[PDB]
Amino acid sequence: CHLSDMLQQLHSVNASKPSERGLVRQEEAEDPACIPIFWVSKWVDYSDKYGLGYQLCDNSVGVLFNDSTRLILYNDGDSLQYIERDGTESYLTVSSHPNSLMKKITLLKYFRNYMSEHLLKAGANITPREGLPYLRTWFRTRSAIILHLSNGSVQINFFQDHTKLILCPLMAAVTYIDEKRDFRTYRLSLLEEYGCCKELASRLRYARTMVDKLLSSRSASNR
Numbered sequence: 001c002h003l004s005d006m007l008q009q010l011h012s013v014n015a016s017k018p019s020e021r022g023l024v025r026q027e028e029a030e031d032p033a034c035i036p037i038f039w040v041s042k043w044v045d046y047s048d049k050y051g052l053g054y055q056l057c058d059n060s061v062g063v064l065f066n067d068s069t070r071l072i073l074y075n076d077g078d079s080l081q082y083i084e085r086d087g088t089e090s091y092l093t094v095s096s097h098p099n100s101l102m103k104k105i106t107l108l109k110y111f112r113n114y115m116s117e118h119l120l121k122a123g124a125n126i127t128p129r130e131g132l133p134y135l136r137t138w139f140r141t142r143s144a145i146i147l148h149l150s151n152g153s154v155q156i157n158f159f160q161d162h163t164k165l166i167l168c169p170l171m172a173a174v175t176y177i178d179e180k181r182d183f184r185t186y187r188l189s190l191l192e193e194y195g196c197c198k199e200l201a202s203r204l205r206y207a208r209t210m211v212d213k214l215l216s217s218r219s220a221s222n223r
Helices: 003-015 099-117 188-194 198-221
Strands: 040-046 051-056 061-065 070-073 079-083 089-093 135-140 144-149 154-158 164-168 173-177 183-187
Touching: 003 188, 003 198, 040 099, 040 144, 051 099, 051 135, 061 099, 061 135, 070 099, 079 099, 135 198, 144 198, 154 198, 164 198, 173 188, 173 198, 183 188
Parallel strands: none
Antiparallel strands: 040 051, 051 061, 061 070, 070 079, 079 089, 135 144, 144 154, 154 164, 164 173, 173 183
16 A cells, blocks of 8 residues: 555654744645545444445545445446455446345445435535545544545544544645635645644644554554
8 A cells, every 4th residue: 555655754744843943834835736636525433333434525435344345436326346355346336236235235325315415524615636445444543533545545534623634645745624624735845845833743743643553553464
């Protein structure tokens, strides 16, 4: 995956101590060309029985079931992709799907319907850049929920103040959605040059810890 790439990027930007500069010029690091193609707009933790369902900013939906398999539905409302525990992908459609997936497709439909009429869309005011990933894994801490997409992106939504970070190792950029719901995207390399505010800096440090956790978990699974 690209978690190692993200770790290299985060280690470097944090090592630069971006908030400890004579004159922070964060605005110079912003770049709309780096806006993510995808991010999680909504999610529902129904781990008590089925798993975690979620909606991406393009209105597609998906679910990481308790059995570690995934099912995602494109925003066209018919194209489906089933991903087994080990990552094996199968391309299907709602119109023509194997009966073996009836239950999971039904569960995804319930998640889809719920998220279609309930909850706010994170980054609703932002249009993703044009280029479908699935949720590789997720977990919660006492402070936030961490979501890792198959395209390498890692999203961290903080519970207390509703602030969020969307990190992409391909663009080597970070999107920070603040408490006022302002959505700004920065090149990590430019944050090293121009610095940034203490709020973003602190969250980037937390992000590095979360990425280490994700890497540690993968390492454990690989024995």
